[PDB]
Design a binder for this molecule. Sequence first.
Ligand SMILES: CCNC(=O)c1cc2c(N[C@H](c3ccc4ncn(C)c(=O)c4c3)C(C)C)ncnc2[nH]1
Length: 168
Amino acid sequence: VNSFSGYLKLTDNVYIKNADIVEEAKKVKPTVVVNAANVYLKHGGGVAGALNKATNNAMQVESDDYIATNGPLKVGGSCVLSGHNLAKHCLHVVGPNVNKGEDIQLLKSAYENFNQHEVLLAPLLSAGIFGADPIHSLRVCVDTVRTNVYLAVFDKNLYDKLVSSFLE
Ligand SMILES: CCNC(=O)c1cc2c(N[C@H](c3ccc4ncn(C)c(=O)c4c3)C(C)C)ncnc2[nH]1
């Protein structure tokens, strides 16, 4: 039903909220929820772990079956699979992990995958333990994504820093 509420409007197509993406999926019932994935779709940590546990491991079982037949994704690439009880679809997107020396230019390719979907609920790509500068990730999102994106950032201090920086 895509019932997004409580978001700050950054641009005509980008919105942001201090929220847990799992609780937003449950409230919103989005057509697409984005997972901040890795290339072998191992959902043990961070956002991926939180989404998988909220599906009672159904997302990991589906992902393992996908990987056995298709192999891993590339950094900057994506894969649409079921959204299970959280969304109609889950768009698994691999942003570069700069803490492991991956190419930051691939963050643009990662966000370009969002343009295949009219509206998405998403986390801030390559942020947190992936090490990219979160202000840079938001700028890449705003400059790359043309479709409607609702960003859930589960950290009040980070949310306030991003909003303050964007409003300069
Ligand atoms: C209480 C259950 N929910 C969560 O743990 C949770 C965590 C959530 C979250 N995390 C953000 C984030 C973004 C990109 C990432 N890319 C790769 N990896 C490995 C991450 O762990 C990762 C994490 C950080 C930057 C705040 N963003 C929204 N919603 C959330 N929910």
